[PDB]
């Protein structure tokens, strides 16, 4: 070994104190040390003061939920939100990300995840989220969200108007059981 060229940083050497230390042990020790120090310095060692979120990661900043769109009639009810896009060609359609944020709602949930994730995982592969396309705003589109504040009972129904004064259901999305989301694409 004395013949070989081994890379090493002069300051990091003093921390390399064990041969074949598992990568997880090294990094867990560092991260848990940071957690312990922050708990002491910012939370008085009280874990109840640490804010809780459904899941961690995603966007650097959460999008502000824009609730006012020109040409969209929105109605809120205890068990039901309805969103109706104008059929008038002179009115612009809502921007896609703002529209999907309004449908997702402010709370990180399966509904938020379904509409706001940029990718869906197929096996180990990344696929651009097709939900963003099928839920994209269209003229005369009508969206109904049942139980919008109860994720276990939340149902999203999307309706289109292929013929004057007749709505047809074209998408139904709901949670089945604890973790399975079923999205039904409906042919009329």
Using CB under 8 A, which of the segments 7-15, 70-78, 99-107, 154-162 binds other proteins?
Answer: 7-15
CA 53, 54, 59, 63 torsion: positive or negative?
negative
Give the nearest distance from C-beta 122 to other proteins in angstroms: 7
Give the nearest distance from C-beta 80 to other proteins in angstroms: 26
Beta strands 72-77 and 80-85, pairing class: antiparallel
Site for other proteins in 128-187 (CB under 8 A): none
Structure tokens belonging to residue 69: 């769109």
- The answer to whether residue 5 forms part of the interface with other proteins (CB under 8 A) is no
Task: For residue 82, give the nearest of 107, 110, 103, 113 by alpha carbon.
Answer: 103
- Give the one residue of 4, 37, 105, 161 binding other proteins; rule: CB under 8 A: 37
Compute the chain's Rg from CA coordinates: 25
* Residue closer to other proteins, measured from CB, 1 or 11: 11
- The answer to whether residue 60 forms part of the interface with other proteins (CB under 8 A) is yes
How long a stretch of residues is the chain? 188
Alpha-carbon gap, residue 122 to 88, rounded angstroms: 38
- The answer to whether residue 96 forms part of the interface with other proteins (CB under 8 A) is no
Using CB under 8 A, which of the segments 13-21, 77-85, 91-99, 149-157 binds other proteins?
Answer: 13-21
- Give the one residue of 126, 130, 134, 182 binding other proteins; rule: CB under 8 A: 126
* Residue closer to other proteins, measured from CB, 59 or 133: 59
Using CB under 8 A, which of the segments 40-48, 85-93, 131-139, 142-150 binds other proteins?
Answer: 40-48
Indicate the SS3 state at residue 11: coil
Alpha-carbon gap, residue 42 to 91, rounded angstroms: 50
Structure tokens belonging to residue 48: 């109840």
Continuous segment of H or E residues that includes residue 31: helix 23-43
> Which residues of this protein are in contact with other proteins, per CB under 8 A?
7-16, 22-24, 27-35, 37-39, 41-43, 47, 50-60, 121-127
């Amino acid at each position: 070994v004395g013949r070989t060229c081994i890379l090493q940083g002069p300051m990091a050497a003093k921390h390399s104190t064990k041969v074949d230390e598992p990568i997880k042990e090294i990094l867990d020790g560092i991260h848990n040390g940071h957690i312990a120090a922050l708990k002491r310095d910012l939370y008085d060692n009280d874990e109840s003061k640490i804010p809780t979120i459904e899941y961690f990661g995603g966007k650097l900043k959460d999008p502000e939920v824009q609730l006012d769109f020109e040409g969209v009639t929105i109605s809120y009810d205890v068990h039901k939100n309805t969103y109706r896009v104008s059929n008038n060609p002179s009115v612009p359609l809502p921007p896609l990300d703002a529209w999907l944020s309004a449908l997702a709602g402010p709370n990180r949930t399966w509904r938020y995840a379904l509409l706001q994730s940029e990718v869906i995982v197929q096996g180990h592969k990344y696929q651009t989220n097709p939900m963003k396309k099928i839920f994209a705003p269209a003229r005369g589109l009508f969206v109904e969200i049942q139980y919008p504040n109860d994720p276990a009972k939340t149902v999203i129904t999307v309706k289109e108007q292929p013929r004057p004064n007749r709505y047809i259901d074209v998408i139904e999305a709901k949670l089945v059981g604890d973790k399975e989301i079923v999205v039904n694409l409906i042919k009329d």
